[PDB]
Design an enzyme around this catalytic site. Sequence first.
Site, PDB file in Angstrom:
ATOM      1  CB  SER A  30    -119.763 -55.530  88.774  1.00  0.00           C
ATOM      2  OG  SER A  30    -119.796 -55.033  87.464  1.00  0.00           O
TER       3      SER A  30
ATOM      4  CB  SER B 196    -126.294 -47.565  84.577  1.00  0.00           C
ATOM      5  OG  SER B 196    -125.581 -46.668  83.783  1.00  0.00           O
ATOM      6  CG  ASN B 197    -120.893 -51.247  83.989  1.00  0.00           C
ATOM      7  OD1 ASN B 197    -120.688 -51.756  85.084  1.00  0.00           O
ATOM      8  ND2 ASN B 197    -121.136 -51.959  82.893  1.00  0.00           N
TER       9      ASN B 197
END
Length: 342
Positions: free
Chosen positions: A58, A156-157
Amino acid sequence: QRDRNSVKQAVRDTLQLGFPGILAKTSEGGKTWSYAAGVANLSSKKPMKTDFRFRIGSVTKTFTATVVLQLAEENRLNLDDSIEKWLPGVIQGNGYDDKQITIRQLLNHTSGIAEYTRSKSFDLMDTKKSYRAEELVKMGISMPPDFAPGKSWSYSNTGYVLLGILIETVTGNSYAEEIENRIIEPLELSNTFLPGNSSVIPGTKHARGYIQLDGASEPKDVTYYNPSMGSSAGDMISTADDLNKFFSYLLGGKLLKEQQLKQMLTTVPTGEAALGRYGLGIYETKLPNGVSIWGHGGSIPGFVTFAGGTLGGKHTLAVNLNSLNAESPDPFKNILLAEFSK
């Protein structure tokens, strides 16, 4: 002057939370320092080294947001555009309403688009599967909105996978091309890679990466893992050096101009000792002493990372562990306390 012993100690003790090895590097006033403990390989016991490449997970979100913000600067998109203008017909069904979802919201996780990794069709431990971005979007919207756009916060990817699609809709170029051409190449991030669906971490300059879903089990070697499950939400590979340079340029006004950097640092509450205040692909970690560290973490099978820095870009840190240990999700807290206190 900085007490580096306290940092070494905090670096070394992090391993006792159940990690094979650890690297970190810091830059402050242009004065750098390098840390490494533990092992690259649990079976051969080769030592962790400081200049290794690792999956940043991320932290990729900060590179994607930066591209989206440069595009806003160039008048190619607006943060408050609805995504319906850009990608009609995509986010729909299940009571989704795309006309209320904005680009800004995807960036700060307020859209309410559901997280694809919660789907039952998703398997973190599948280390092979190639996903196209649109398949991840569809997996996410197979579940209903978590909330109405803009009414709440939830990681939320799916929203960042959508942003990678958006970027291409805007410019005609893949998100990787844009990250490469705008960030990697101009900053000369010569150990930073966008691997697509390839499972290779290039070269010998990296450790083995592991996953342990358990505590009462062996860590499994997942060095080769298909990062297409992360896409523009999490696929990148980099080094402590390249991530320090990135965060230092970003936070020191050299990548985004003042108007866009201000938007990036405008935050919403997360509600969460977890992250703090979340901005556009970046969040604020506030220490007891009043110090704010702006950056992002990552956690993908094999590798857990944090990189970040102080406003103005003159003090940064990056750190990586070569295992994803589900029992210790927040491992870097004492390192930061040592390096950024007082």
